[PDB]
């Protein structure tokens, strides 16, 4: 069962058969105990990450399949083992950051979330540093500024859920940081990119979750300029 998924994920499947099995896998990972998830383990993770990389790296079912993986990832990581095992990967943090394509906003939402939750993790470390480095890594791959995908998601046309998502990741990248000069440096690089013009707009919006992330962004911004 755990083992047949892996076998199937290593079998060269494509398109709807891939989608369908990923969907199946998603429920499996969601409904099953943590022992089944270890059974699926790093070998299972690695095969999801392998297909993900192939989809990221190529260009009808691509977006959906990338998304369904990102969904499978959420489930795998809904326990300690899965969190540890993702963070043990060479490339998995990076393949999440690469899932933040403003053109596919709901997978971006799901990927931004999981990155934000890594950032606020009690153990490991500064996982925010690890996420930034991955964003750096991605920026020169795609030849864009590193915080640009995030500012693209705060654009006026996009869904409130995405807006919330991006601002929430900004907040997860900054809050956990111990250095003031790092924090203000990040804040400042974002404002250079056009964040100040967007906050004006975001601050009009009717949403409680949006109001919450703006409150966090503002209050920490105040206290930092006050400290400095």
């Amino acid at each position: 069962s755990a083992m047949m998924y892996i076998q199937e994920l290593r079998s060269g499947l494509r398109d709807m058969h891939l989608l369908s099995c990923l969907e199946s896998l998603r429920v499996s990972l969601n409904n099953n105990p943590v022992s089944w998830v270890q059974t699926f383990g790093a070998e299972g993770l690695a095969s999801l990450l392998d297909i993900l990389k192939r989809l990221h790296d190529e260009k009808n079912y691509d977006s959906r399949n990338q998304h369904e993986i990102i969904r499978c990832l959420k489930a795998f990581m809904n326990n300690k083992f899965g969190i540890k095992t993702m963070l043990e990967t060479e490339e998995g943090i990076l393949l999440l950051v690469r899932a933040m394509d403003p053109a596919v906003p709901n997978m971006m939402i799901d990927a931004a979330k999981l990155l934000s939750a890594l950032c606020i993790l009690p153990q490991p470390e500064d996982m925010n540093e690890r996420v930034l480095e991955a964003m750096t890594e991605r920026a020169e791959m795609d030849e864009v500024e590193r915080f640009q995908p995030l500012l693209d998601g705060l654009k006026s046309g996009t869904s409130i859920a995405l807006k919330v998502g991006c601002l929430q990741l900004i907040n997860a990248l900054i809050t956990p940081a111990e250095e003031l000069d790092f924090r203000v440096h990040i804040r400042s690089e974002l404002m250079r990119l056009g964040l100040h013009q967007v906050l004006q707009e975001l601050r009009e919006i009717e949403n409680e979750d949006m109001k919450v992330q703006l409150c966090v962004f503002d209050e920490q911004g105040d206290e930092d300029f006050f400290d400095l």
């Binding site: 105990p33 959420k74 809904n78 326990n79 899965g82 999981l114 606020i120 929430q168 997860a172 919450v212």
Partner: peptide, 20 residues
Amino acid sequence: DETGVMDSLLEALQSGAAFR
């Protein structure tokens, strides 16, 4: 052995408690 770990983190983010 307990699930819903990610689920705890997503909720602390969403409300604002995480920050901190």
